[PDB]
Amino acid sequence: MLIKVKTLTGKEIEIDIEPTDKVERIKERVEEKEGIPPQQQRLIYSGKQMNDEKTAADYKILGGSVLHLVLALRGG
Amino acid sequence: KLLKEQKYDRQLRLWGDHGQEALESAHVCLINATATGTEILKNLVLPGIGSFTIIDGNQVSGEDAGNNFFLQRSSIGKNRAEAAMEFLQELNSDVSGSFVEESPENLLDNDPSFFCRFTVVVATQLPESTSLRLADVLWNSQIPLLICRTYGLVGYMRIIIKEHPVIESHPDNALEDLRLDKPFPELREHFQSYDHSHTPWIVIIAKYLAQWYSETNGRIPKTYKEKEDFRDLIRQGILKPEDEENFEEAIKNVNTALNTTQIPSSIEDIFNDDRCINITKQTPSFWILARALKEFVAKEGQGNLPVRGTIPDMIADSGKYIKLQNVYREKAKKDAAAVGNHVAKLLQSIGQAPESISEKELKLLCSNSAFLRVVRCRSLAEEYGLDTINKDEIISSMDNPDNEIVLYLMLRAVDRFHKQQGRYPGVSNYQVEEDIGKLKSCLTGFLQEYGLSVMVKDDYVHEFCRYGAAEPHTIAAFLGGAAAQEVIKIITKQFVIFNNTYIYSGMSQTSATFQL
Amino acid sequence: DWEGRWNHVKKFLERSGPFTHPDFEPSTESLQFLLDTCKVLVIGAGGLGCELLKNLALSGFRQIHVIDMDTIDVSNLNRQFLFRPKDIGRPKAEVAAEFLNDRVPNCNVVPHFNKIQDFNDTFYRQFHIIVCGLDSIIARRWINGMLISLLNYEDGVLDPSSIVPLIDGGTEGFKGNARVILPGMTACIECTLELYPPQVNFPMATIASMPRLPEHCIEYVRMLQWPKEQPFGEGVPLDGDDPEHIQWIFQKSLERASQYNIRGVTYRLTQGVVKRIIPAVASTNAVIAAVCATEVFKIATSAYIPLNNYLVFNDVDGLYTYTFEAERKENCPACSQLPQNIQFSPSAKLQEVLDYLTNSASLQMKSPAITATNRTLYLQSVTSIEERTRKELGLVDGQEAVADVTTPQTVLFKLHFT
Numbered sequence A: 001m002l003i004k005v006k007t008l009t010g011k012e013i014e015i016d017i018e019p020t021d022k023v024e025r026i027k028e029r030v031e032e033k034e035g036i037p038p039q040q041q042r043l044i045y046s047g048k049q050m051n052d053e054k055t056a057a058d059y060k061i062l063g064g065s066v067l068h069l070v071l072a073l074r075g076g
Numbered sequence B: 001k002l003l004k005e006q007k008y009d010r011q012l013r014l015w016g017d018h019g020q021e022a023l024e025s026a027h028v029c030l031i032n033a034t035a036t037g038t039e040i041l042k043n044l045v046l047p048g049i050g051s052f053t054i055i056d057g058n059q060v061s062g063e064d065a066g067n068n069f070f071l072q073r074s075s076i077g078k079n080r081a082e083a084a085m086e087f088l089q090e091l092n093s094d095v096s097g098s099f100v101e102e103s104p105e106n107l108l109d110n111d112p113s114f115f116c117r118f119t120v121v122v123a124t125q126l127p128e129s130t131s132l133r134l135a136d137v138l139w140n141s142q143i144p145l146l147i148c149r150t151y152g153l154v155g156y157m158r159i160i161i162k163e164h165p166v167i168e169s170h171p172d173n174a175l176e177d178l179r180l181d182k183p184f185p186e187l188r189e190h191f192q193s194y195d196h197s198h199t200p201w202i203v204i205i206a207k208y209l210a211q212w213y214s215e216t217n218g219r220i221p222k223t224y225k226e227k228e229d230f231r232d233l234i235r236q237g238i239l240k241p242e243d244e245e246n247f248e249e250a251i252k253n254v255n256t257a258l259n260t261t262q263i264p265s266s267i268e269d270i271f272n273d274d275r276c277i278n279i280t281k282q283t284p285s286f287w288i289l290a291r292a293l294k295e296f297v298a299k300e301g302q303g304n305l306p307v308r309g310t311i312p313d314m315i316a317d318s319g320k321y322i323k324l325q326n327v328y329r330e331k332a333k334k335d336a337a338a339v340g341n342h343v344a345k346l347l348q349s350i351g352q353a354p355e356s357i358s359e360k361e362l363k364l365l366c367s368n369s370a371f372l373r374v375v376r377c378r379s380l381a382e383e384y385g386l387d388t389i390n391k392d393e394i395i396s397s398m399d400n401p402d403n404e405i406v407l408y409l410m411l412r413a414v415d416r417f418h419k420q421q422g423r424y425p426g427v428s429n430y431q432v433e434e435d436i437g438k439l440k441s442c443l444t445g446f447l448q449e450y451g452l453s454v455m456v457k458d459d460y461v462h463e464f465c466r467y468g469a470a471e472p473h474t475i476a477a478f479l480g481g482a483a484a485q486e487v488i489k490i491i492t493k494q495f496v497i498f499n500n501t502y503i504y505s506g507m508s509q510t511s512a513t514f515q516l
Numbered sequence C: 001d002w003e004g005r006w007n008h009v010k011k012f013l014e015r016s017g018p019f020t021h022p023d024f025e026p027s028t029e030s031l032q033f034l035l036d037t038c039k040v041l042v043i044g045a046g047g048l049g050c051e052l053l054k055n056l057a058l059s060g061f062r063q064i065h066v067i068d069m070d071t072i073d074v075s076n077l078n079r080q081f082l083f084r085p086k087d088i089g090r091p092k093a094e095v096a097a098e099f100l101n102d103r104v105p106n107c108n109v110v111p112h113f114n115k116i117q118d119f120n121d122t123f124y125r126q127f128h129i130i131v132c133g134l135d136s137i138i139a140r141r142w143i144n145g146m147l148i149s150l151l152n153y154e155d156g157v158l159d160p161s162s163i164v165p166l167i168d169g170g171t172e173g174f175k176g177n178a179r180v181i182l183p184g185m186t187a188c189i190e191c192t193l194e195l196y197p198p199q200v201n202f203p204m205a206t207i208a209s210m211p212r213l214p215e216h217c218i219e220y221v222r223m224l225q226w227p228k229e230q231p232f233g234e235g236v237p238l239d240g241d242d243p244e245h246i247q248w249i250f251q252k253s254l255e256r257a258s259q260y261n262i263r264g265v266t267y268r269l270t271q272g273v274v275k276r277i278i279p280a281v282a283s284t285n286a287v288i289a290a291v292c293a294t295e296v297f298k299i300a301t302s303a304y305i306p307l308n309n310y311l312v313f314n315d316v317d318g319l320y321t322y323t324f325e326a327e328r329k330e331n332c333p334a335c336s337q338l339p340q341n342i343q344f345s346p347s348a349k350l351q352e353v354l355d356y357l358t359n360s361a362s363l364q365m366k367s368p369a370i371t372a373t374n375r376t377l378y379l380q381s382v383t384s385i386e387e388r389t390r391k392e393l394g395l396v397d398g399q400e401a402v403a404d405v406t407t408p409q410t411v412l413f414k415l416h417f418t
Helices: A023-034 B009-024 B035-045 B062-067 B080-089 B104-110 B112-117 B128-141 B185-192 B201-214 B223-235 B245-257 B265-272 B285-298 B318-348 B359-367 B380-384 B391-397 B405-421 B429-449 B458-467 B473-492 C007-014 C030-037 C048-057 C092-103 C121-125 C137-149 C204-209 C214-223 C243-259 C267-275 C282-301 C354-359 C383-388
Strands: A002-006 A013-016 A066-069 B027-030 B051-055 B096-100 B120-124 B145-151 B154-160 B164-166 B373-375 B502-505 B510-513 C040-043 C064-067 C110-112 C129-132 C152-154 C157-159 C166-172 C175-181 C311-314 C320-323
Touching (some): A023 B245, B009 B473, B009 C267, B027 B035, B027 B112, B035 B051, B035 B080, B035 C282, B051 B080, B104 B128, B112 B128, B120 B128, B128 B145, B145 B473, B154 B405, B154 B473, B185 B201, B201 B223, B223 B245, B265 B285, B391 B405, B405 B429, B405 B458, B429 B458, B458 C007, C007 C030, C030 C282, C048 C064, C048 C129, C048 C166, C064 C092, C092 C110, C129 C137, C129 C282, C175 C282, C214 C243, C214 C267, C282 C311
Parallel strands (some): B027 B120, C129 C166
Antiparallel strands (some): A002 A013, B154 B502, C152 C157, C311 C320
């Protein structure tokens, strides 16, 4: 399965995952490619904010599906 | 003097002192002083932009004072350029304001060369004619132009710079140039040179990496496995079960540290550009440095860019970390000198003084060798041209009846309508009814004139008529903020500018960048 | 009040449209009603705050209130455009209203030189909409609970008129976000609490023993060296805004750095580290506040459909924005219609709850307090705490619950888990 995750600057990288992988690993793939610490990654698939303890399957991710890295900011 | 550094601290932490210098030395030209222009300029005066000049021929109207935070009732009837200049002036005494009580068109006629004074030109709420004309004049004059427009709940923004190179790209997140996969002598010697938690995780990975290399000759690709197995190799080394936090840390970095050396695709392209390949006395600083970088790669770089010379922090003995850190720092310093040589030679073969390029420039380039970026915008003419119109992009995007590019098309139609009807759709309440048709006619006329086989919901034709070409402050304000920063990027050359047309929909609170 | 003034607004209230919110009724009377009766509260006055005030004022709002406990500082002037050097030292909320009420003809901004915790339900019920431009997570969390406690459920059925829309904006460098919350319906601040990145914390092990970065040297002279030797007199606290205090820390940091021969200790970095400073510029605040404002207008006029609770923005590389509808956690300790029914142990001891509440990433409470029935267990909030602030009998006394928590300002509400 080949999914895509869009960076916080809308870069969008392609990643290989099998429905059996944990969200936790999807982040490692991202880091591996972009150098984005999994610590500061927040993934979002169709509204749901992916828990890195569940599996890609858990969120009905399928090949073409696109995930988004997101954030919330403190200052004002 | 030092009072400034106190006032600008929050932003100096973003573009540093040199950025601030660039900014305080620039001179910006804002065309129309409407809310959009006024807001954009507001976000530039505050930061401390050198000086600005407002060119507006219009008179402040009632609705003008109504949506502009820099025009009061007391200034209705006076010149909109002068009026705004006074209020904006108040935001920062370190900024010098000026104004020209004439129209863009007027200036483009009686004196085109006028705009060569400006670092950048920001034009707002202009009609097709004036844009195309101004875009043209400035394109030839080599002046950066940013066309901004607020129409209803739609924010339009198109940037036009022939070529904009940037060294200090400022990337959020990048990979570390640790290069364990292709270590350099000094680095290797350092590793050989080898309180269990006091040992840098890199040295740890290097050790077990060396071992694995003997029992294999392998580098450890096989993601899913080899790396996972390489971890278990590290685990079988933790002091009789003592703890080892850094060890476990190394195990986590294994997902990164393995392959961290390879020339970026974007840089390959810079290297391959004609501007880099064929140098001349004309060739600007940036490209000469790019060539020097390429030359380096070929020779002493041995396949890769200069070593960055910066490593991440890592749980480790105070002195051990600092020693490790110097290995890179020192190496980096060397690669820099090498690149420096290639520069001088290149400069000489061109006739320029070996010192035509500062050491500061050199050092910075080498740090960002892996993040250089070049942006080139299509001329406004190429976009509006019948043959050059990038219809591939338009049609493609339109696959979604609600892709922000609907708004672009509608803006072209509204423009057609204006050119045609001599006024904008639905400005007066009673006109709405009638114009909804007249507008769709222009939409279709526009789509046919370019052969754009696209479906545009009739809803959008309605909406734009509802807009009555209004310039809602909250919309103008959004644009004002985004535009100002792009302008600051142009001036400081410190970040990456969007490529061509940016479209914001206040309706859906979404936006997208198009073309290129 | 003068010919043409609200033309840029009238078009959205007098005309109907294809994307108009369902309940929308085009009217010529609408505008005036908005100006006269819609009460909006702006929380914060420094960047998002200032920007917000201007946006609302020029959008048809008159009845505006602003809360802010801060005082104008020189380093606000690069973005908080309602303050001038002459105003340094004065109350932000004061000067802000002062300025706006003058620049925009008939605006009626009412300032409140207070901190959000000074008020209670009575006060917040007054407003139709509340827009935030806060600068801390806690505050967003606090005001979040407050707006939820206003909810009124008529026998399980939530009364809609008890919902106070909450628009929140955030900023950090060239990044920012905006969201629209409808307490009791849309995902709350708590529901999305984990979208906030982790805070870079230094293990003291390295701060006191193995310093590597200039930040480590500074963190030492601030966290340890200062207390250990009362620099400016005994008992005297470290004032991050005291140029002399920073100068002393900068100094002692140069020394510590020199010890472990670490380069990079600058005066600017000293302030940054000590004040946990967030880089900021006018541009980003303008963008977020503009979005939030537009959303307040929509909500008050139904002229369009309100944003679907979330937008992220980024300037560093071109222009990027991601808009999405964040799911409302059905077990939100905060916006959960009913109690948090979850058991974290068969029945051993205490600590095994205080920590669950304190460390569970979805709760992240600070020095909480549990109440049983009607007694108090542990509190942390002096001696009252102490007695109980220092178990299986009680870790059995409840048996199978409705144990009741309250975190130090994390929430205005009393969270009831079971």
